[PDB]
Amino acid sequence: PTQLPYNEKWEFPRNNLQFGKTLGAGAFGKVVEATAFGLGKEDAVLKVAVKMLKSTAHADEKEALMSELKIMSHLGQHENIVNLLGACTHGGPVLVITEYCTYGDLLNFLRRKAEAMLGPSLSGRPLELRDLLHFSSQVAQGMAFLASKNCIHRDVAARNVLLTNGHVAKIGDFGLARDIMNDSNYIVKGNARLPVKWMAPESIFDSVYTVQSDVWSYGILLWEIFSLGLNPYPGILVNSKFYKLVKDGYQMAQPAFAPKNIYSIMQACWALEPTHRPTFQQITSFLQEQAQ
Ligand SMILES: COc1ncc(F)cc1CNc1ccc(Cc2c[nH]c3ncc(C)cc23)c(F)n1
């Protein structure tokens, strides 16, 4: 990624952004909503999400932001990913301008939505099964696009899916703008904080990441969707027993709102042999057909 070249076609004048509230923050980074004036070929004026370093960041974090910018440019645009809209690299700190997604991350959306649906009994518009299938197929479409570019995401999870206008799902990555240090979904495994409960066995044990390991993580995401935002392996501590169980083929039980169909997809994503797992295109075609 560092050898990749940054194309100035993305360059945008930083004085043409008016910043609003912070959308998310990590230790050394954050994403901030902004209005951009004159953005793009149509000179649009619109709300954007700007990723930038915090004052706590150092050179290593700057290099990672620039690398992310180079990767987003190289990837190309797709309806079901968080697209790059421009960047500010001259005359100040690096700014990465991405699409703003009004409904926020999918995980929180499902949890708040489930609470809203249960409110009448205990005190707009409820979710339907078809919505869950749409979210699932949209994310699989976006993952099929990344896989077609041989791009490995490595942190597929509902917290990294964003919902835009029309409640269209987009796979993104909060990255530096996530507080992983204080986030119980990231486990201290040796040197780094890793989303172990989402990770394929070969990534945990052999440090191997592929499109097929993303497929596994996508199956965990499917479980999050069709449980309306439960934590995976709920109540189970990540320890030696957990690692062994995963390696031996232990799998989560069927989620409450998953049709047998969809749970079977999950199981296929969790095949121990990575080549046996479905491809994102197979998942997409099946889920599109199911969402009709
Ligand atoms: C496949 O995606 C990628 N792959 C590799 C990469 F290196 C980067 C990406 C996508 N980069 C990115 C940037 C910012 C954000 C946060 C974000 C954007 N819009 C929002 N609207 C609302 C809220 C609450 C948050 C946001 C996000 F999710 N992803």
Residue numbers in the entry: 566 to 688, 747 to 915
Quote the authors verbatim.
As we previously demonstrated, microglia are critically dependent on CSF1R signaling for their survival, and we set out to develop specific CSF1R inhibitors that were orally bioavailable, brain-penetrant, and able to achieve robust brain-wide microglia elimination for extended periods of time. Of note, loss of function mutations in the tyrosine kinase domain of the Csf1r are associated with the development of adult-onset leukoencephalopathy with axonal spheroids and pigmented glia, the onset of which is thought to derive from microglial phenotypic alterations. To that end, we designed, synthesized, and optimized a potent, specific, orally bioavailable, and brain-penetrant CSF1R inhibitor, PLX5622, to deplete microglia for > 6 months in 5xFAD mice.
Using a structure-guided drug design strategy based on the existing CSF1R/KIT/FLT3 inhibitor PLX339710,18, combined with in vivo screening for optimal PK, brain penetrance, and microglial depletion, we created PLX5622, with crystallography revealing the interactions between PLX5622 and the CSF1R. Cell free kinase inhibitor profiling revealed that PLX5622 is highly specific for the CSF1R, showing > 20-fold selectivity over KIT and FLT3, the two most homologous receptors. Two key structural differences between PLX5622 and PLX3397 contribute to the improved selectivity based on crystallographic analysis. First, the 2-fluoro substitution on the middle pyridine ring of PLX5622 is designed to access the CSF1R-unique space next to Gly-795 (a gate-keeper to the interior allosteric pocket); both KIT and FLT3 have a bulkier cysteine at the equivalent position. Anchored on both ends by hydrogen bonds and hydrophobic packing, PLX5622 has the fluorine atom at a fixed position. As van der Waals repulsion increases in proportion to the 6th power of the distance between two atoms, a larger gate keeper residue (as seen in KIT and FLT3) will likely incur an energetic penalty for the steric hindrance. Second, the terminal pyridine group of PLX5622 is optimized to stabilize the allosteric pocket of CSF1R vacated by the displaced juxtamembrane domain.
